Amino acid sequence: NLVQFGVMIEKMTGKSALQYNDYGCYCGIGGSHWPVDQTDWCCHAHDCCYGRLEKLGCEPKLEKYLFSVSERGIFCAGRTTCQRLTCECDKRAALCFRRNLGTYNRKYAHYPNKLCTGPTPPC
Numbered sequence: 001n002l003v004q005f006g007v008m009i010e011k012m013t014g015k016s017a018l019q020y021n022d023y024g025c026y027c028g029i030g031g032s033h034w035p036v037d038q039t040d041w042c043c044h045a046h047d048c049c050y051g052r053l054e055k056l057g058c059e060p061k062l063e064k065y066l067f068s069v070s071e072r073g074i075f076c077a078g079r080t081t082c083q084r085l086t087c088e089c090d091k092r093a094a095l096c097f098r099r100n101l102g103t104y105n106r107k108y109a110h111y112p113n114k115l116c117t118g119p120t121p122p123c
């Protein structure tokens with residue numbers, strides 16, 4: 001589940017999965033207001049991704065999938081299309097995290113969500 005997404009995050013970023021939980025305004029359960037940085041935007045997008053999966057009849061918060069990581073990249077798999085879809089959402093987020101390692105800031109880990117201000121961007 002988040003065992004999988006967590007494992008994917010660690011593989012792609014070199015960081016513990018817990019360093020992405022509660023990051024900024026969107027990484028973690030829920031989220032509102034304006035994303036603090038590009039990493040946070042990855043999380044905003046991932047929430048939107050899960051919302052699309054829910055609208056398709058999937059339960060992405062619960063879906064368990066399979067994946068591998070080689071030189072060629074992240075390969076997704078699973079018995080059901082919903083499992084594979086969840087993997088695609090997670091893959092995209094984990095690649096986004098890696099791509100934005102340069103602006104990852106430790107001060108946004110465990111960000112007090114009262115500091116989140118401004119409008120909530122649409123999906």
Ligand SMILES: CCc1c(CC(N)=O)c2cc(OCCCP(=O)(O)O)ccc2n1Cc1ccccc1
Pocket residue numbers: 002003005006007009017018020021022026027028029030031042043044046047050061
């Ligand atoms: C990678 C940061 C992260 C995200 C991405 C994010 N976008 O928040 C995330 C999404 C979740 O579902 C949220 C379901 C969707 P809603 O947010 O309830 O709408 C649950 C936990 C989440 N963690 C922390 C985490 C992930 C894996 C292992 C340990 C900790």
Ligand SMILES: [Ca+2]
Pocket residue numbers: 026027028029030031043044047
């Ligand atoms: Ca979130």
Ligand SMILES: [Cl-]
Pocket residue numbers: 045046048049089092
């Ligand atoms: Cl997405």
Ligand SMILES: [Cl-]
Pocket residue numbers: 054058059060061062
């Ligand atoms: Cl769900």
Ligand SMILES: [Cl-]
Pocket residue numbers: 067068069
């Ligand atoms: Cl692997």
Ligand SMILES: [Cl-]
Pocket residue numbers: 072073074075
């Ligand atoms: Cl890839």
Ligand SMILES: [Cl-]
Pocket residue numbers: 080081082083
């Ligand atoms: Cl399915």
Ligand SMILES: [Cl-]
Pocket residue numbers: 104105106107
């Ligand atoms: Cl830092």
Ligand SMILES: [Cl-]
Pocket residue numbers: 015106
């Ligand atoms: Cl760090």
